[PDB]
Paper text:
The Omicron sub-lineages harbor multiple mutations in the S protein compared to the original strain (referred to as the WT strain), which mediates receptor recognition and facilitates membrane fusion with the host cells. Despite the extensive mutations, all these Omicron subvariants still utilize [name] as the host receptor.
We then employed single-particle cryo-electron microscopy (cryo-EM) to determine the structures of trimeric S proteins in complex with [name]-PD. In comparison to the BA.2 subvariant, BA.2.75 exhibits additional mutations in the RBD, including D339H, G446S, N460K, and R493Q. The monomeric human [name]-PD exhibited binding to the RBDs of BA.2, BA.5, BA.2.75, BF.7, and XBB.1 with binding affinity (KD) of 4.80 ± 0.01, 3.2 ± 0.03, 1.2 ± 0.01, 4.1 ± 0.02, and 16.2 ± 0.03 nM, respectively. These values displayed heterogeneity compared to the WT RBD (12.5 ± 0.04 nM). For example, compared to BA.2, BA.2.75, XBB.1, and BF.7 carry additional mutations in the N-terminal domain, suggesting the increasing ability to evade antibodies targeting the N-terminal domain.
Residue numbers in the entry:
A (entry chain A): 540 to 621, 640 to 676, 690 to 734
B (entry chain A): 1028 to 1146
C (entry chain B): 735 to 826, 854 to 939, 944 to 1075
D (entry chain C): 735 to 783
E (entry chain A): 296 to 344
The structure:
Amino acid sequence: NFNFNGLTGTGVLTESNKKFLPFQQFGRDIADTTDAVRDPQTLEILDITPCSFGGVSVITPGTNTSNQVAVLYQGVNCTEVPSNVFQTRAGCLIGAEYVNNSYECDIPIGAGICASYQTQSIIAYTMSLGAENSVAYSNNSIAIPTNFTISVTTEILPVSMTKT
Amino acid sequence: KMSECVLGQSKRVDFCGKGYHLMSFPQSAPHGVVFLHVTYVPAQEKNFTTAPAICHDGKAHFPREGVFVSNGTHWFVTQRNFYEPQIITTDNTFVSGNCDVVIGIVNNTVYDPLQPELD
Amino acid sequence: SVDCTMYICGDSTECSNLLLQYGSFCTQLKRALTGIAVEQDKNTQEVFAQVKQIYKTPPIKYFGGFNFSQILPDPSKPSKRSPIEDLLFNKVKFNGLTVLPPLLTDEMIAQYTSALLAGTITSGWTFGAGPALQIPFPMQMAYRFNGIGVTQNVLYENQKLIANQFNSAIGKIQDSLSALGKLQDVVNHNAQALNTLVKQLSSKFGAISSVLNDILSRLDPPEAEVQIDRLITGRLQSLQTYVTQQLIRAAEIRASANLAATKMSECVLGQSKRVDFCGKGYHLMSFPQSAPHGVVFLHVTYVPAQEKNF
Amino acid sequence: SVDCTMYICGDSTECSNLLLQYGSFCTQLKRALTGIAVEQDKNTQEVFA
Amino acid sequence: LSETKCTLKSFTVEKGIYQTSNFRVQPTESIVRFPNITNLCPFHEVFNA
Ligand SMILES: *[C@@H]1O[C@H](CO)[C@@H](O[C@@H]2O[C@H](CO)[C@@H](O)[C@H](O)[C@H]2NC(C)=O)[C@H](O)[C@H]1NC(C)=O
Ligand SMILES: *[C@@H]1O[C@H](CO)[C@@H](O[C@@H]2O[C@H](CO)[C@@H](O)[C@H](O)[C@H]2NC(C)=O)[C@H](O)[C@H]1NC(C)=O
Ligand SMILES: *[C@@H]1O[C@H](CO)[C@@H](O[C@@H]2O[C@H](CO)[C@@H](O)[C@H](O)[C@H]2NC(C)=O)[C@H](O)[C@H]1NC(C)=O
Ligand SMILES: *[C@@H]1O[C@H](CO)[C@@H](O[C@@H]2O[C@H](CO)[C@@H](O)[C@H](O)[C@H]2NC(C)=O)[C@H](O)[C@H]1NC(C)=O
Ligand SMILES: *[C@@H]1O[C@H](CO)[C@@H](O[C@@H]2O[C@H](CO)[C@@H](O)[C@H](O)[C@H]2NC(C)=O)[C@H](O)[C@H]1NC(C)=O
Ligand SMILES: *[C@@H]1O[C@H](CO)[C@@H](O[C@@H]2O[C@H](CO)[C@@H](O)[C@H](O)[C@H]2NC(C)=O)[C@H](O)[C@H]1NC(C)=O
Ligand SMILES: *[C@@H]1O[C@H](CO)[C@@H](O[C@@H]2O[C@H](CO)[C@@H](O)[C@H](O)[C@H]2NC(C)=O)[C@H](O)[C@H]1NC(C)=O
Ligand SMILES: *[C@@H]1O[C@H](CO)[C@@H](O[C@@H]2O[C@H](CO)[C@@H](O)[C@H](O)[C@H]2NC(C)=O)[C@H](O)[C@H]1NC(C)=O
Ligand SMILES: *[C@@H]1O[C@H](CO)[C@@H](O)[C@H](O)[C@H]1NC(C)=O
Ligand SMILES: *[C@@H]1O[C@H](CO)[C@@H](O)[C@H](O)[C@H]1NC(C)=O
Ligand SMILES: *[C@@H]1O[C@H](CO)[C@@H](O)[C@H](O)[C@H]1NC(C)=O
Ligand SMILES: *[C@@H]1O[C@H](CO)[C@@H](O)[C@H](O)[C@H]1NC(C)=O
């Protein structure tokens, strides 16, 4: 919590590498927020970055399966959170182990990272896209079906809501 | 969807189910509607070898509504979605041109039904 | 996502107890914004994840001629995008405000689009109705000429000319590219609507000042609560305006992603007879490419030329 | 279109300077109303031309 | 798990992923920066003449 001869603010202070003109005190961003200052006594430029905030999410396999839980701190660097600590493009995940396998998605974490209660507890590791089919294409080959199946599926659509 | 899947047969892909639309049935729900889509799905495929045309007597023959296929040694015509091979005759093929402009022509005999029967 | 309490009050504690008196106004706004964010991932799942398997093109890569090299993936890249998808991607913390990342990376989106492309080039329209059944590309092109009412020897006797015309038309697209204003407009309107919400924090709405410390710092509680309630009223009105417009703007993006899903089904996974749904002319086939926050469809059509009278 | 300032104040400077304490409400309102006047010409260009 | 049950207002949560709260680092101490000092009143001549 800082006060630079009038400028009151909060944040992390860091050594800069910008160069003010020798009469300018602080710098502003587009959308007009203070993002640099000059220290009056030593006259050096320091950047002002905001601290760290973010949502907290809880990943559960369902209380009818287990009571273990994993926790996602969203877009927080996993070194400033307060076992399994795992860093994701979506935040820091605690309480799930990261495996190297891959096949489908169960609980979506983000940025191609999913979790499941398998190997159980909570885990993190994308969710893949789908199987892998390899068509034997050639310049004189064809495949023709010899049988069929009759299939029937459903589709549900809302038409109305309640008149109040 | 009630107009195009229940009172008709749709050709639009993936509009009345997944597969080839045969028919649809409506059912009422609390504040909406359920469609039951009946579609055809092909199954159990085999590979064969194909050609675009058949050369015979210096002419190029194309199938009227099918594909030319080969089981390894013989040449037939099927319809494209269900395997049902037929002898290539002048009743299920048509002619246009000579057989040196198409690429992939194969040599095979096209059977004339009148020629023997008459004689 | 906006934290209602941190945008309004913001650190101060005299403001949180006063805002607690308004009920569930801030819970509603967070629900409204969270619904919008969950809808944006379903938009993308509905447009792009329209394929069971991840199909691959064969190594030889020779479609009896036709040349698809500018739209197939580039193996010498971390992103594995195509040449035209690389052209398209070079043309397009605060007071409680946060940006969440999409569930699908755009590597994943490029991987869905290349599989849709290899399904089409190798199996025609059979992979959209069941298992992929290979067919040679010239014969698939001849099936499609039948679908527009042309007899199929017109293709086989003109194969080289038809392949050259396709190749030149594909070459002209990069030059016409190296347009995307419909994708820039969405980004611009959203950034500009987010800039106004932040600028609305330096307004006094009829209080002495617009900074929650100086207001109190120069007065008692009985006298400051009056000004802080005016500040609260203005800042809550601004946030409601913002959220209502995001709700109206997301329903417009959803109607567009719904049109894209229908086009991907009907112009890429099949051949359409609907007039002008897949370009001008008689629809032959269509190819998808991923753009930032969007999709590009390259429609191949047949246009008649050089008529005589009889 | 509606001029937001002339609707609220209507040729009065005492009211206009007090209206400046709310920020960009009238700019927002005019921008919203103009964007739906531009959409109407696009609507009939897309049907008839 | 209990914070999730409270967020949903239920005693049975079905499988999924739920946003439950937020993590905000905490700041300690308040550093007040400022400038040096100007001339000091010449009190030494009025008192020491
Ligand atoms: C404000 O005063 C401090 C000292 O009270 C000055 O700090 C001096 O900075 C010079 C650098 O040119 C050093 O060589 C001195 O040793 C520093 N003095 C002390 C006591 O640390 C500071 O420079 C002054 N502010 C300005 C703008 O000159
Ligand atoms: C086509 O597929 C059907 C299955 O859908 C085959 O019929 C099945 O045959 C097995 C073995 O004879 C029986 O156990 C099943 O009861 C049959 N299913 C039904 C629904 O009757 C049929 O034989 C296949 N046809 C060909 C030519 O392969
Ligand atoms: C069609 O023929 C191809 C060519 O052999 C078959 O595809 C190969 O199948 C084997 C065994 O499943 C694989 O190991 C190869 O990788 C496949 N691809 C090749 C050789 O390019 C395919 O199974 C045949 N299809 C049917 C329906 O019988
Ligand atoms: C391709 O199909 C033909 C069917 O016309 C097969 O040839 C016949 O096979 C039957 C039974 O083996 C014999 O009774 C006939 O004499 C054969 N010839 C004719 C003209 O009918 C042929 O064997 C099949 N080839 C393969 C590789 O399966
Ligand atoms: C298909 O049949 C034609 C006619 O029977 C073949 O043409 C002959 O090919 C031989 C060998 O190349 C030549 O010596 C003859 O002069 C050709 N005759 C004519 C009229 O062109 C043709 O080669 C056959 N195709 C294949 C692949 O065997
Ligand atoms: C497919 O088309 C591309 C053009 O977009 C071909 O690549 C170019 O080929 C010309 C000569 O034909 C070269 O001068 C260019 O440098 C090539 N551009 C590249 C490699 O980026 C490509 O060869 C065509 N494919 C085939 C199989 O011919
Ligand atoms: C087919 O014939 C018609 C004429 O019957 C051509 O239209 C003529 O074009 C000339 C020059 O533009 C006009 O001066 C005539 O008035 C037109 N005729 C009529 C009846 O209006 C038409 O261009 C011809 N098209 C082709 C492909 O030959
Ligand atoms: C008032 O004036 C007297 C004399 O001018 C100051 O006395 C000086 O004190 C310092 C420190 O004790 C000595 O180093 C000097 O030698 C003294 N001066 C003489 C002439 O002896 C006294 O300091 C002054 N008062 C103040 C408050 O500064
Ligand atoms: C939920 O519990 C019931 C009974 O305890 C059990 O039959 C059912 O399989 C459970 N569901 C899951 C998903 O485990
Ligand atoms: C977290 O901070 C450390 C220390 O600077 C840094 O090495 C790491 O890269 C940061 N996290 C991310 C995701 O960059
Ligand atoms: C996953 O595979 C990589 C291969 O580069 C390896 O380095 C890593 O140790 C593996 N992870 C685990 C948990 O075994
Ligand atoms: C198919 O490719 C083979 C190469 O294995 C070549 O010999 C043949 O001429 C080609 N035929 C057609 C019809 O493209």
